[PDB]
Each structure stands twice: as structure tokens, then as C-alpha cells.
Short mmCIF file of C-alpha atoms in Angstrom, two decimals:
data_model
loop_
_atom_site.label_atom_id
_atom_site.label_comp_id
_atom_site.label_asym_id
_atom_site.label_seq_id
_atom_site.Cartn_x
_atom_site.Cartn_y
_atom_site.Cartn_z
CA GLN A 36 35.34 -25.37 -22.43
CA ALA A 37 33.53 -27.15 -19.62
CA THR A 38 32.33 -30.11 -21.72
CA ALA A 39 30.49 -33.36 -21.24
CA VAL A 40 29.49 -36.43 -23.24
CA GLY A 41 26.19 -38.12 -24.03
CA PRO A 42 24.26 -39.88 -21.26
CA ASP A 43 25.30 -43.28 -22.68
CA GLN A 44 28.94 -42.47 -23.53
CA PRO A 45 31.93 -43.57 -21.43
CA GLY A 46 32.86 -40.89 -18.94
CA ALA A 47 29.29 -39.67 -18.39
CA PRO A 48 27.65 -38.93 -15.02
CA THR A 49 24.82 -41.01 -13.59
CA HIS A 50 22.84 -38.16 -11.99
CA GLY A 51 22.37 -34.42 -12.40
CA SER A 52 21.05 -31.27 -10.73
CA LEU A 53 18.72 -28.30 -11.25
CA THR A 54 19.77 -25.03 -9.61
CA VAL A 55 17.04 -22.38 -9.43
CA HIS A 56 17.98 -18.69 -9.21
CA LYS A 57 14.90 -16.62 -8.32
CA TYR A 58 14.92 -12.89 -9.08
CA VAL A 59 12.34 -10.13 -9.47
CA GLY A 60 12.25 -8.11 -12.69
CA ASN A 64 17.22 -14.25 -21.71
CA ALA A 65 15.05 -16.93 -23.29
CA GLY A 66 17.05 -19.83 -21.87
CA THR A 67 20.23 -21.87 -22.60
CA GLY A 68 20.56 -23.93 -19.40
CA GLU A 69 23.98 -22.89 -18.11
CA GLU A 70 24.90 -20.75 -15.12
CA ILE A 71 25.70 -17.15 -16.06
CA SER A 72 27.05 -15.63 -12.84
CA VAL A 73 26.02 -12.10 -13.90
CA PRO A 74 22.89 -11.53 -11.78
CA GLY A 75 21.72 -7.97 -12.37
CA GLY A 76 20.07 -7.46 -9.00
CA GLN A 77 17.11 -8.24 -6.71
CA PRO A 78 17.12 -11.82 -5.37
CA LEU A 79 13.96 -13.34 -3.92
CA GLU A 80 13.58 -15.82 -1.06
CA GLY A 81 10.49 -17.79 -0.10
CA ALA A 82 9.83 -19.20 -3.57
CA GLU A 83 8.64 -22.81 -3.34
CA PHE A 84 9.23 -25.10 -6.33
CA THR A 85 7.79 -28.62 -6.52
CA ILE A 86 9.47 -30.99 -8.99
CA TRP A 87 8.00 -34.26 -10.27
CA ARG A 88 9.96 -36.92 -12.12
CA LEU A 89 8.08 -38.11 -15.20
CA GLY A 90 7.59 -41.68 -16.35
CA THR A 91 5.70 -43.41 -19.15
CA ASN A 92 2.46 -45.41 -18.99
CA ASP A 95 0.04 -50.90 -15.79
CA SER A 96 2.63 -48.93 -13.79
CA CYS A 97 4.65 -45.73 -14.14
CA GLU A 98 8.12 -46.65 -15.40
CA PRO A 99 10.48 -43.66 -15.03
CA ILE A 100 12.01 -42.04 -18.09
CA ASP A 101 15.70 -42.98 -18.30
CA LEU A 102 17.53 -40.58 -20.60
CA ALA A 103 20.46 -43.01 -20.73
CA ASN A 104 18.24 -45.26 -22.88
CA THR A 105 17.96 -44.10 -26.49
CA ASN A 106 14.28 -44.99 -26.84
CA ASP A 107 13.24 -42.73 -23.95
CA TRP A 108 14.31 -39.56 -25.78
CA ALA A 109 11.26 -39.98 -28.03
CA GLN A 110 9.12 -39.12 -24.99
CA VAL A 111 10.98 -35.85 -24.30
CA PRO A 112 8.56 -33.00 -25.15
CA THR A 113 9.29 -30.31 -27.72
CA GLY A 114 7.04 -27.41 -26.69
CA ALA A 115 6.34 -25.63 -23.43
CA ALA A 116 4.97 -27.35 -20.36
CA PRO A 117 1.25 -27.40 -19.52
CA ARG A 118 0.21 -25.01 -16.77
CA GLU A 119 -1.69 -27.68 -14.79
CA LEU A 120 -0.42 -30.96 -13.36
CA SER A 121 -3.48 -32.77 -14.72
CA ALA A 122 -2.57 -31.89 -18.31
CA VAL A 123 0.93 -33.34 -17.97
CA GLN A 124 -0.63 -36.41 -16.34
CA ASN A 125 -2.39 -37.16 -19.65
CA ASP A 126 0.83 -37.43 -21.67
CA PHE A 127 3.14 -38.67 -18.89
CA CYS A 128 2.69 -40.26 -15.47
CA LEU A 129 4.06 -39.09 -12.14
CA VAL A 130 6.68 -41.23 -10.42
CA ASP A 131 6.84 -39.42 -7.07
CA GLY A 132 4.29 -37.30 -5.24
CA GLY A 133 6.37 -34.17 -5.75
CA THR A 134 9.37 -32.75 -3.87
CA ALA A 135 8.91 -29.14 -2.75
CA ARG A 136 11.80 -26.95 -1.59
CA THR A 137 12.26 -23.22 -1.01
CA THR A 138 14.83 -20.71 -2.25
CA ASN A 139 17.31 -19.04 0.11
CA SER A 140 18.51 -15.48 0.70
CA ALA A 141 20.39 -15.63 -2.61
CA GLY A 142 17.13 -16.72 -4.22
CA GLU A 143 18.64 -20.13 -4.93
CA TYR A 144 18.03 -23.82 -4.35
CA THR A 145 19.65 -26.84 -6.00
CA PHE A 146 17.74 -30.08 -6.60
CA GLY A 147 20.69 -32.44 -6.37
CA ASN A 148 21.23 -36.06 -7.40
CA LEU A 149 18.55 -36.26 -10.10
CA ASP A 150 18.59 -39.42 -12.20
CA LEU A 151 18.84 -39.00 -15.97
CA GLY A 152 15.21 -38.40 -16.81
CA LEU A 153 12.42 -35.92 -17.46
CA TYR A 154 11.18 -33.55 -14.75
CA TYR A 155 8.23 -31.18 -14.39
CA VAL A 156 8.60 -28.09 -12.18
CA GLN A 157 6.05 -25.49 -11.10
CA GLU A 158 6.38 -22.69 -8.54
CA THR A 159 3.82 -23.85 -5.98
CA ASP A 160 4.26 -20.96 -3.51
CA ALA A 161 5.76 -17.48 -3.25
CA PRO A 162 5.74 -14.51 -0.85
CA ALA A 163 2.53 -12.51 -0.56
CA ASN A 164 4.40 -9.62 -2.20
CA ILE A 165 4.47 -11.74 -5.38
CA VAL A 166 1.52 -11.50 -7.77
CA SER A 167 2.68 -13.52 -10.81
CA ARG A 168 4.88 -16.60 -10.52
CA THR A 169 6.90 -18.29 -13.25
CA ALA A 170 5.20 -20.62 -15.70
CA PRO A 171 5.59 -24.38 -15.16
CA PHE A 172 8.47 -25.76 -17.20
CA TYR A 173 10.05 -29.06 -18.21
CA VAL A 174 13.66 -30.01 -17.46
CA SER A 175 15.67 -32.83 -19.01
CA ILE A 176 18.76 -34.20 -17.26
CA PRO A 177 21.05 -34.00 -19.22
CA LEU A 178 20.36 -30.93 -21.35
CA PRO A 179 21.79 -30.58 -24.89
CA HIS A 180 24.11 -27.55 -24.91
CA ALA A 181 25.89 -25.93 -27.90
CA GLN A 182 28.99 -24.93 -25.91
CA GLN A 183 29.27 -27.69 -23.26
CA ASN A 184 27.87 -30.46 -25.57
CA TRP A 185 25.80 -31.92 -22.74
CA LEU A 186 24.65 -30.10 -19.53
CA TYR A 187 23.94 -32.19 -16.42
CA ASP A 188 23.94 -29.44 -13.76
CA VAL A 189 21.22 -27.23 -15.25
CA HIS A 190 20.51 -23.68 -14.08
CA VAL A 191 17.11 -22.02 -14.53
CA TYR A 192 16.32 -18.32 -13.95
CA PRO A 193 12.53 -18.07 -13.47
CA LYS A 194 10.59 -14.81 -13.53
CA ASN A 195 8.62 -13.50 -10.50
CA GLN A 196 6.42 -10.33 -10.53
CA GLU A 197 5.64 -8.23 -7.45
CA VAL A 198 3.14 -5.49 -6.67
CA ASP A 199 4.63 -2.06 -6.02
CA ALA A 200 3.82 -0.27 -2.78
CA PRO A 201 1.08 2.38 -3.10
CA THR A 202 1.70 6.03 -2.30
CA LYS A 203 -0.76 8.22 -0.37
CA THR A 204 -0.54 12.02 -0.28
CA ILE A 205 -2.91 14.44 1.56
CA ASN A 206 -4.42 17.70 0.20
CA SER A 207 -2.26 20.71 1.01
CA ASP A 208 -2.70 23.57 3.50
CA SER A 209 -3.80 26.01 0.77
CA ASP A 210 -6.33 23.56 -0.58
CA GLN A 211 -7.47 23.01 3.04
CA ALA A 212 -9.00 26.45 3.43
CA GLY A 213 -12.08 25.81 1.30
CA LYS A 214 -12.39 22.17 2.38
CA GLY A 215 -12.96 23.13 6.00
CA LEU A 216 -11.05 24.17 9.11
CA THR A 217 -13.02 23.08 12.20
CA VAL A 218 -13.30 19.68 13.86
CA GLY A 219 -15.83 17.79 11.77
CA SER A 220 -14.44 18.94 8.41
CA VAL A 221 -12.85 16.58 5.87
CA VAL A 222 -9.52 16.00 4.12
CA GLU A 223 -8.60 14.41 0.80
CA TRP A 224 -6.03 11.67 0.22
CA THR A 225 -4.67 10.46 -3.13
CA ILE A 226 -3.69 6.78 -3.29
CA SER A 227 -1.40 6.55 -6.33
CA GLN A 228 -0.53 2.96 -7.29
CA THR A 229 1.67 1.75 -10.13
CA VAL A 230 0.20 -1.32 -11.83
CA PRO A 231 2.35 -4.47 -11.48
CA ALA A 232 3.67 -6.38 -14.45
CA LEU A 233 2.42 -9.90 -15.15
CA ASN A 234 4.06 -12.98 -16.63
CA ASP A 235 3.19 -13.88 -20.21
CA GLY A 236 -0.19 -15.60 -20.53
CA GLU A 237 -1.92 -14.39 -17.36
CA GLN A 238 -4.85 -11.96 -17.20
CA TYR A 239 -5.61 -9.70 -14.25
CA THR A 240 -8.09 -11.39 -11.89
CA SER A 241 -8.54 -9.32 -8.72
CA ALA A 242 -7.58 -5.67 -8.18
CA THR A 243 -8.26 -4.15 -4.77
CA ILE A 244 -7.12 -1.09 -2.83
CA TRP A 245 -8.27 -0.89 0.79
CA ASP A 246 -7.91 1.77 3.55
CA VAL A 247 -8.93 0.65 7.05
CA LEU A 248 -9.91 3.62 9.21
CA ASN A 249 -9.56 4.05 12.96
CA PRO A 250 -13.15 4.81 14.07
CA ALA A 251 -11.85 7.15 16.80
CA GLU A 252 -10.08 9.49 14.35
CA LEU A 253 -11.41 9.26 10.77
CA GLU A 254 -14.65 8.32 9.03
CA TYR A 255 -15.29 7.76 5.33
CA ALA A 256 -17.19 10.61 3.65
CA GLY A 257 -17.02 10.00 -0.10
CA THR A 258 -14.73 9.05 -2.96
CA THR A 259 -14.20 11.85 -5.48
CA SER A 260 -11.93 10.32 -8.16
CA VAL A 261 -10.13 7.14 -9.28
CA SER A 262 -8.11 7.92 -12.44
CA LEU A 263 -6.13 5.77 -14.88
CA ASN A 264 -2.98 7.58 -16.09
CA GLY A 265 -4.97 10.82 -15.90
CA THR A 266 -8.21 9.34 -17.27
CA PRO A 267 -10.72 9.02 -14.39
CA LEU A 268 -13.44 6.57 -13.49
CA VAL A 269 -16.85 5.15 -14.39
CA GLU A 270 -19.84 4.43 -12.14
CA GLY A 271 -20.33 0.66 -12.38
CA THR A 272 -17.11 -0.30 -14.18
CA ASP A 273 -14.62 0.33 -11.35
CA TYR A 274 -16.70 -0.69 -8.33
CA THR A 275 -15.93 1.77 -5.53
CA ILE A 276 -18.09 1.00 -2.48
CA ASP A 277 -17.66 -1.21 0.61
CA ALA A 278 -17.69 1.73 3.00
CA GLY A 279 -16.95 -0.33 6.11
CA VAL A 280 -13.18 -0.84 5.93
CA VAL A 281 -12.87 1.32 2.80
CA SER A 282 -12.04 -1.03 -0.08
CA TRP A 283 -12.21 -0.77 -3.88
CA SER A 284 -12.65 -3.98 -5.89
CA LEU A 285 -12.47 -3.57 -9.70
CA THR A 286 -14.45 -5.44 -12.39
CA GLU A 287 -13.20 -7.35 -15.44
CA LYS A 288 -13.64 -4.47 -17.90
CA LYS A 289 -11.01 -2.21 -16.31
CA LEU A 290 -9.04 -5.37 -15.51
CA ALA A 291 -8.80 -6.18 -19.24
CA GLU A 292 -7.79 -2.56 -19.94
CA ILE A 293 -4.78 -1.87 -17.69
CA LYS A 294 -1.19 -2.41 -18.83
CA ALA A 295 2.08 -2.67 -16.92
CA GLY A 296 2.98 0.81 -15.72
CA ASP A 297 -0.59 2.13 -15.60
CA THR A 298 -0.71 4.53 -12.66
CA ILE A 299 -4.08 4.55 -10.89
CA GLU A 300 -4.90 7.30 -8.28
CA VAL A 301 -7.87 6.94 -5.91
CA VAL A 302 -9.05 10.10 -4.14
CA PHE A 303 -11.53 9.99 -1.25
CA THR A 304 -12.70 12.15 1.65
CA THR A 305 -12.56 11.35 5.37
CA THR A 306 -14.39 13.25 8.10
CA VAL A 307 -12.00 14.28 10.87
CA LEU A 308 -13.94 13.23 13.96
CA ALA A 309 -12.05 14.38 17.07
CA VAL A 310 -8.73 15.76 18.31
CA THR A 311 -6.49 12.93 19.51
CA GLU A 312 -4.44 13.29 22.70
CA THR A 313 -1.43 13.65 20.40
CA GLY A 314 -3.36 15.46 17.65
CA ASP A 315 -1.44 13.51 14.98
CA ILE A 316 -3.84 11.64 12.68
CA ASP A 317 -1.93 9.38 10.28
CA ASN A 318 -2.84 6.90 7.53
CA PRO A 319 0.06 4.36 7.26
CA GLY A 320 0.23 1.15 5.27
CA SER A 321 -1.53 -2.08 6.22
CA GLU A 322 -0.60 -5.58 5.08
CA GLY A 323 -4.30 -6.47 4.94
CA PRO A 324 -7.80 -5.51 6.09
CA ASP A 325 -6.62 -6.65 9.53
CA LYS A 326 -5.55 -3.34 11.10
CA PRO A 327 -5.85 0.35 10.09
CA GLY A 328 -3.93 1.42 7.01
CA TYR A 329 -3.98 1.14 3.20
CA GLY A 330 -2.70 -1.50 0.79
CA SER A 331 -3.12 -3.15 -2.60
CA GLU A 332 -3.92 -6.58 -4.04
CA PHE A 333 -3.36 -7.99 -7.54
CA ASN A 334 -4.21 -11.64 -8.30
CA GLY A 335 -3.85 -12.46 -4.61
CA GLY A 336 -0.53 -10.65 -4.14
CA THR A 337 -0.84 -8.04 -1.40
CA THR A 338 1.41 -5.28 -0.10
CA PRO A 339 1.13 -2.48 2.48
CA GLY A 340 1.44 1.17 1.62
CA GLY A 341 4.73 3.02 1.58
CA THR A 342 4.29 6.68 2.48
CA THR A 343 2.46 7.92 5.58
CA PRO A 344 0.73 11.33 5.42
CA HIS A 345 -0.38 13.29 8.47
CA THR A 346 -3.08 15.78 9.41
CA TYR A 347 -2.52 17.82 12.58
CA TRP A 348 -5.32 19.23 14.74
CA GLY A 349 -5.27 21.16 18.01
CA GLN A 350 -7.66 22.63 20.55
CA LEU A 351 -8.47 26.01 22.06
CA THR A 352 -10.73 27.12 24.92
CA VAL A 353 -11.53 30.69 25.96
CA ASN A 354 -12.52 31.96 29.42
CA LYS A 355 -14.41 35.26 29.78
CA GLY A 356 -13.78 37.70 32.59
CA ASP A 357 -13.69 41.35 33.51
CA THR A 358 -10.47 43.37 33.63
CA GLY A 359 -8.25 41.34 35.95
CA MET A 360 -10.13 38.02 35.59
CA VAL A 361 -11.72 38.40 39.03
CA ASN A 362 -15.31 37.93 37.79
CA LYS A 363 -16.38 35.51 35.05
CA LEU A 364 -18.90 37.03 32.64
CA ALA A 365 -21.66 35.54 30.49
CA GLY A 366 -23.01 36.37 27.06
CA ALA A 367 -19.79 37.57 25.43
CA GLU A 368 -19.73 36.51 21.77
CA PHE A 369 -16.49 35.43 20.08
CA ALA A 370 -15.35 34.52 16.58
CA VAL A 371 -12.20 32.95 15.13
CA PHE A 372 -10.77 33.99 11.76
CA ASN A 373 -7.96 32.63 9.58
CA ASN A 374 -6.33 35.91 8.55
CA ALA A 375 -2.97 36.19 10.32
CA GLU A 376 0.11 37.59 8.56
CA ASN A 377 3.50 37.01 10.22
CA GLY A 378 1.91 37.36 13.65
CA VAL A 379 -0.48 40.29 13.17
CA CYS A 380 -4.28 40.38 13.19
CA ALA A 381 -6.76 42.98 12.00
CA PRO A 382 -7.88 45.47 14.69
CA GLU A 383 -11.42 44.04 14.68
CA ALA A 384 -13.09 41.21 12.80
CA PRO A 385 -13.39 41.48 9.00
CA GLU A 386 -16.98 41.22 7.82
CA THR A 387 -16.28 38.01 5.88
CA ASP A 388 -17.69 34.69 7.06
CA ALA A 389 -15.95 33.53 10.23
CA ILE A 390 -14.40 30.12 10.80
CA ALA A 391 -16.11 29.52 14.15
CA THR A 392 -18.29 31.53 16.53
CA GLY A 393 -19.13 31.08 20.19
CA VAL A 394 -20.68 32.63 23.28
CA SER A 395 -19.83 32.54 26.96
CA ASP A 396 -21.99 30.58 29.39
CA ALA A 397 -22.73 30.78 33.13
CA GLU A 398 -19.14 30.33 34.33
CA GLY A 399 -17.78 32.39 31.43
CA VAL A 400 -16.44 29.47 29.37
CA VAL A 401 -16.97 30.11 25.66
CA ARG A 402 -19.10 27.22 24.40
CA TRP A 403 -18.76 27.03 20.62
CA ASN A 404 -21.50 26.53 18.03
CA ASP A 405 -21.75 24.03 15.17
CA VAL A 406 -18.87 21.90 16.52
CA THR A 407 -18.64 18.80 18.69
CA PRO A 408 -18.04 19.04 21.54
CA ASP A 409 -18.92 22.47 22.95
CA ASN A 410 -15.58 22.99 24.71
CA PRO A 411 -12.82 23.13 23.72
CA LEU A 412 -12.71 24.09 20.03
CA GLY A 413 -10.81 21.90 17.57
CA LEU A 414 -9.08 23.79 14.77
CA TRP A 415 -6.92 22.65 11.87
CA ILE A 416 -3.15 23.19 12.00
CA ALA A 417 -1.19 21.75 9.08
CA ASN A 418 -1.18 18.87 6.60
CA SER A 419 1.94 17.04 5.47
CA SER A 420 2.50 14.39 2.82
CA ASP A 421 6.30 14.61 3.10
CA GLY A 422 6.80 12.95 6.45
CA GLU A 423 6.22 14.15 9.98
CA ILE A 424 6.31 17.77 11.11
CA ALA A 425 8.31 18.77 14.19
CA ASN A 426 6.35 21.27 16.31
CA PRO A 427 3.46 22.12 13.95
CA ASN A 428 1.56 25.32 14.64
CA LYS A 429 -0.93 27.63 12.92
CA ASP A 430 -1.94 31.16 13.92
CA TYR A 431 -5.59 32.23 14.16
CA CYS A 432 -7.21 35.53 15.14
CA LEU A 433 -9.70 35.72 18.02
CA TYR A 434 -12.23 38.56 18.17
CA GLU A 435 -14.92 39.50 20.67
CA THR A 436 -17.99 40.59 18.72
CA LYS A 437 -20.48 41.33 21.52
CA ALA A 438 -19.36 42.38 25.00
CA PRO A 439 -21.54 41.99 28.11
CA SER A 440 -23.81 44.92 28.92
CA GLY A 441 -21.69 47.48 30.73
CA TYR A 442 -18.28 46.28 29.50
CA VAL A 443 -15.94 47.34 26.70
CA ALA A 444 -14.68 44.40 24.64
CA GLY A 445 -11.00 43.51 24.81
CA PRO A 446 -8.49 43.79 21.99
CA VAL A 447 -7.81 41.13 19.38
CA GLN A 448 -5.58 38.19 20.33
CA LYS A 449 -3.69 36.03 17.87
CA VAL A 450 -3.68 32.39 18.97
CA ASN A 451 -1.06 29.74 18.19
CA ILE A 452 -2.43 26.19 18.07
CA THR A 453 -0.27 23.12 18.70
CA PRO A 454 -1.35 19.51 18.10
CA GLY A 455 -3.03 17.42 20.76
CA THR A 456 -5.77 17.74 23.35
CA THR A 457 -3.01 17.96 25.97
CA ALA A 458 -1.51 21.02 24.25
CA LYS A 459 -4.82 22.92 24.28
CA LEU A 460 -4.41 26.69 24.36
CA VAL A 461 -6.33 28.40 27.17
CA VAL A 462 -7.05 32.08 26.51
CA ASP A 463 -8.24 34.37 29.31
CA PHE A 464 -10.03 37.08 27.32
CA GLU A 465 -10.73 40.00 29.68
CA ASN A 466 -12.75 43.20 29.20
CA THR A 467 -12.44 46.70 30.74
CA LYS A 468 -15.54 47.91 32.58
CA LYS A 469 -16.25 51.63 32.08
#
């Protein structure tokens, strides 16, 4: 098969190479097996030092028989200082970066001993390969000697978190007026780590736009269904909502441990578009949510939405020629396929209001007075095209000398520009 001879035999090369193939996701052997599997990785920086022996640092020459006594037997130390005790460094290191195929070849390497460590990687990467020794040539059982060595290091990434919102059903009890809250669930799969490393820093952040949302309170952070502890999984830092763990839970999680954080955000106002989203963020720079394990960050994947619209009501007599004061209104969530009850059910209303001097219904317990911001729909499965929810508007108290008008169902569309203006008029006699 492809074969070679010893580094001191006739017909032997003078130099060699080391081709790195970086993938995400086979003890060794040295040769190139052209069966990848999938998922290359670019941006991986590998610095390689040639090793000598202790006056001055005389490089190891693997063409000399005596220098093979220096070749190490076990794994390589994880720090450059530890290898500097046994060996000495000839060069100051040569750092190069993998390509789109996740590959780089260190060519024209003299027959000696080399120390390689992955000195940089993309921010998506949390755990890099362990530092390793390479000998040019490499003893091989099929090709006798191997001068063009191929290494397949291991690189571990952090998966993108997923964020869902509470549903429309669940929204009823949680609140329906502007100023209520919603619940999001940040589900994150724990990333794998390379052998020997322990989890150092675990953080999930969620930067909030101060014009739309405001942190109210975390309700749960569970671990594969098992929830949280008070001071074990630290869950504060309200400003720029973040969640930094502590060593106990860090020494507890395994690869594949799903963790789900649930927190509450106060919906502040109705945006011009009415669409309030929570996308991913690559860091605490701009609004969004993301993760961090051992310094490896990632933005979120899914983007939930909560839609909110407006509604203002004008009071007048029959024909809207005179604007009337003192008429009391109430909004209920009780529509069925476009029908409303004849008059208001005696249950607790969603929002109440009264008309003022110019007959504009100023609403109570909500900011601002006019218009009125009501909930529409929540979606965790992408955007909604033309969202709308039906409410029922009732007049509870009519002005003295007027008979209140009939019930109107109201359809609410997102955005302060799409506000629904209702002219609620009353017959006189």
C-alpha cells in the first residue's frame, strides 16, 4: 500500500507535513481517511511549536537514532509551560487558521517533534481540542512510516436557545390590557465538552427594549423537568436580564441536559407596528437573548411575537351631531364567531371607561387614558399575517335623557396606526 521507510533509510523524505481537519461533533492512527461524516469548521487557529532538547535549544532530529529517546509516550500537557519543563521551544510558534473545508496543512516540517494547541476558535465554539504532540515521521502499521500526518481534532459548540411565548388561552388569566405581562420559556440544550474540562461559566441573557418590554419576575428555571433553587442557580441582574449560574449546578449538568428559563415581562406600550418581538442577540450589546458556556456565545434561534392593538371610542347622540359626557363603557372578552351578548354579562370586565367633556371615552386603570391598548394574539411559531381579536363593547350608563346604544363587537389589529375608532351613538327619547 502507500508505504515509506525509516527516517534514516535510503529513499526517505527530508521533511513532512501535518494536515488538520476540523469538524464539529476514532482514537487516532495518523492517516487521512477521506470519509468525513459532516460539519466542517473554519476559523480554528492552531499554533505549532517545534521541540528541541536542553545552553541552547538544539532541535530534535528524528533522523538521528538517539533523538527518539526524547519522543514522549503519553498525552501532551495542556499548558505550554509544562512542555517547556521537559523540552525547549525552538521557534516562537507558528499560528495558522483552517479554511472552509476546516483544513490547513503545516507543510515542510523537518523530521522532529512538534507541539500543537488550538489557540483560537469561533465564538460559537465552547470547548476546543486538547493540545497534542506530533512526530514527523509517524510509525504506521499499514504504511510503515507516515510523513504526511493527518489529525482530526474535536471542537464543541453551544446550541442555539429556543424561546416560546405563553399561548392565547393561557393569556386570559395573565392579563389582557396594556400593562399586563407575558411569559417566555427559554429552552436551551446543554453543550457537550471535551474530555477533561469542567463547566466554568453558564449564562443566559435577554436584553429588553425599554420602549416595549420591562422585566417583571422569573417564575421557573428547570433542569430536564427538575426546577430551580434560590441561591444555587443565581437568577438576578435585572438590568439587561441575565442569569449566571454557580459551580454547584455547573458540576451537576451533563451533555444533553435541557434547561428552560421562564420569566415575565410587563408589556409597556403599543408600538406603531404593534409587533413586539424577542429575537436572538449575539451578546449583551443589543436587544435579544443568547447563551454562554465557558466563553462560547451564541444568539437565539426562534423569535416569538406578542401582538397588541388600540381602540378609542367617541360618544354622541343619535347621528353623532352632539358629543355627550358621562357615558360609561366596558369591554369584555366573550365573542363567539362574531356575536356578542345583548348586554354585558355580570362577570368582571376587562376594561371600563367613561366619556369626558368632548365625549372621548377616557379609560381607567390603563396608561395612557386614550386610546385603549388591548391584547390580540401570541405566536411562538413565527409571524402572524393580519392578526386580529374580537372584543365586545357595552355601554353601561347612558347620559341622563338618552337610551344607550346596542352592543358593538370590535376587531383589533396590531399597531397604534391601525387603531379602531368607534362612534358609539345613543337614541334620545
